[PDB]
Design a protein around this ligand. Structure first.
Ligand SMILES: [K+]
Lengths: 50, 221, 159, 95, 60
């Protein structure tokens, strides 16, 4: 696997709690998971429709 | 009394130590020179062994882990020619006289005043008289129980104040309640085994704890 | 119930019966020493940056061991006490819960009161809000089963 | 010169009884208020059905091992939580 | 192709474990675990809580 260090294939680094806040970081992590699921539905619909 | 003896740096004085003062405030920040002065009470040089030893090492050499509370005085302030003073001629060993008790007894009473938050002597005297009438067989333990029953010391144990002095200021501002309402005779009463303490200045105390541990908090959540 | 893995069994009352003399002609109780213990002191910590020493006083230091465990029970254990009391108050009395978890009755009742207050805050919507919402769990007392470590080794069985 | 309003306190039970009577009744049964004759209330005890707990530490602080024992505990809690959410959802899905 | 979830909460009785192991499976410390990282700050009182007090940091 070429991405040895980037094991989770992330596009952006996790927010630093000391700068953005613990609550903000936790919300960001939840949003990231939902985006991955939403993108999956988004690719499938486009392929099926076009 | 705007003296130096009423500041944390010089609060406690002990004439039986190489450095007469003693540090008792766990959150006081000392300079490099001040730390060096206090360190002289911790390290001692042994001639025959040609090494430096610490107070903790001295206890280990004496095989002392749990000892009667009256026996710790002979370990902190005395020396022995077979464990920690080997190689010194007996002529130069220090032996105390019966005339040094007054300085020691006065020092310990000052310690009780400091722990309670710079209380007056009459305050301690009445506390001792109070315990004389309460039930119990061991006088020494009754005094200890009285100290714990004090409201300001209990607030310190909760972990919401840096020291007893900060806890006392919180009581004057009514930042802690007793049984749902602000306490009456808060500076003179004793707590009972079923009392409930709660913080009313929630926003203030939460900020205090967060700031204290901000530097020791991990950078990964 | 073995002393190796039962601190409570190690910290148990002792039955003392000591004698001096001849049981066939005359004996007397041995009262030359105190086998019941006394108040002790110990040095616990030394801060090398501020030169601060900490001393701990114990009422029964010579006849007890690892007394610091009682006040440092995990959050999982405390929730288990709270759930057992709610499930069956008839069997899970204060006496039974104290014996089960090797603590005192006063501690058991105090733990229940604090957990009850916290539950009201969660239900009212004052705690575990936003990203931490999923960690507020509502449990029906009927749908609760306690497993036991009956099989030797790793593994928990329902009965 | 303080803008802080005067605080007159009250016992926790006193405030709860006026805000949520159901929670107050449940607490009495849990806290063993019916065992002592002197403190026994006149009203009959109410049965306890549902309770709420916090599992943040048990999920992300206390069980790090990879053994089946630790994995099973986390899975059971997660499964039970989903059931609770689904029951709430079913109450609203019907038109 | 596995048994479906029954709908019940199954929690082990950790009260039957040996005293040499903590709840998390690690070795049980026989003495208070103090650290210089916390003993110089307001946390010094938290790490040395006595046995006659019950403190809750969720409700203070
Ligand atoms: K004075």
């Amino acid at each position: 696997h070429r991405f040895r260090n980037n094991k989770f294939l992330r596009l952006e680094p996790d927010l630093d709690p000391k700068v953005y806040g613990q609550t903000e970081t936790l919300q960001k992590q939840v949003d990231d998971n939902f985006s991955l699921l939403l993108a999956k539905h988004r690719l499938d619909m486009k392929a099926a429709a076009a | 009394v705007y003296r130096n003896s009423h500041t944390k740096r010089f609060s406690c004085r002990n004439s039986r130590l190489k450095y007469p003062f003693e540090q008792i405030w766990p959150t006081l920040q000392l300079s490099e020179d001040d730390a060096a002065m206090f360190r002289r009470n911790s390290r001692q040089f042994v001639v025959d062994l040609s090494q430096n030893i610490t107070l903790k090492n001295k206890f280990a050499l004496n095989k002392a882990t749990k000892i009667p509370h009256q026996d710790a005085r002979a370990l902190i302030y005395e020396s022995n020619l077979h464990l920690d003073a080997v190689g010194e001629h007996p002529r130069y060993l220090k032996i105390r006289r019966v005339t040094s008790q007054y300085g020691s007894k006065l020092m310990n009473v000052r310690k009780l005043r400091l722990l309670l938050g710079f209380k007056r002597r009459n305050f301690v005297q009445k506390l001792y008289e109070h315990t004389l009438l309460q039930q119990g067989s061991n006088k020494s333990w009754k005094v200890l129980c009285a100290l714990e029953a004090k409201m300001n010391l209990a607030v310190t144990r909760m972990g919401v104040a840096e020291d007893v002095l900060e806890a006392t200021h919180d009581l004057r501002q009514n930042n802690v309640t007793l049984n749902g309402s602000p306490a009456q005779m808060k500076h003179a009463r004793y707590l009972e085994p079923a009392d409930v303490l709660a913080v009313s200045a929630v926003s203030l105390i939460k900020q205090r704890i967060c700031k204290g541990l901000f530097e020791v908090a991990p950078n990964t959540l | 119930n073995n002393p190796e893995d039962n601190i409570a069994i190690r910290n148990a009352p002792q039955k003392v019966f000591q004698l001096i003399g001849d049981p066939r002609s005359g004996v007397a109780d041995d009262v030359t020493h105190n086998p019941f213990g006394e108040i002790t002191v110990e040095m616990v910590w030394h801060q090398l940056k501020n030169e601060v020493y900490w001393y701990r006083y114990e009422f029964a230091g010579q006849t007890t061991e690892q007394s610091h465990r009682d006040s440092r029970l995990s959050d999982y254990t405390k929730n288990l006490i709270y759930l057992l009391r709610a499930k069956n108050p008839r069997k899970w009395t204060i006496e039974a819960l104290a014996e089960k978890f090797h603590i005192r009755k006063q501690r058991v009742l105090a733990i229940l009161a604090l957990k009850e207050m916290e539950a009201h805050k969660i239900e009212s919507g004052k705690q575990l809000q936003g990203p931490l919402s999923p960690y507020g769990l509502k449990v029906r007392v009927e749908d609760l089963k306690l497993l036991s470590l009956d099989p030797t080794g790793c593994g928990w069985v329902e009965p | 010169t303080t803008r802080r309003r005067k605080l007159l306190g009250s016992r926790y039970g006193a405030r709860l009884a006026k805000k949520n009577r159901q929670q107050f009744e449940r607490a009495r049964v849990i806290l063993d208020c019916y065992s002592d004759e002197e403190l026994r209330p006149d009203s009959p005890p109410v049965a306890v059905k549902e309770v709420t707990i916090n599992t943040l530490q048990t999920m992300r602080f206390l069980f790090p091992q990879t053994s089946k024992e630790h994995l099973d505990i986390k899975q059971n809690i997660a499964s039970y939580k989903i059931f609770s959410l689904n029951r709430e959802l079913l109450s609203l899905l019907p038109k | 192709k596995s048994k479906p979830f029954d709908g019940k909460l199954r929690l082990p009785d950790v009260s039957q474990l040996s005293d040499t192991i903590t709840v998390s499976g690690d070795a049980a410390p026989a003495t208070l675990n103090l650290d210089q990282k916390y003993m110089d700050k307001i946390s010094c009182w938290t790490q040395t809580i006595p046995s006659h007090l019950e403190m809750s940091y969720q409700n203070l």
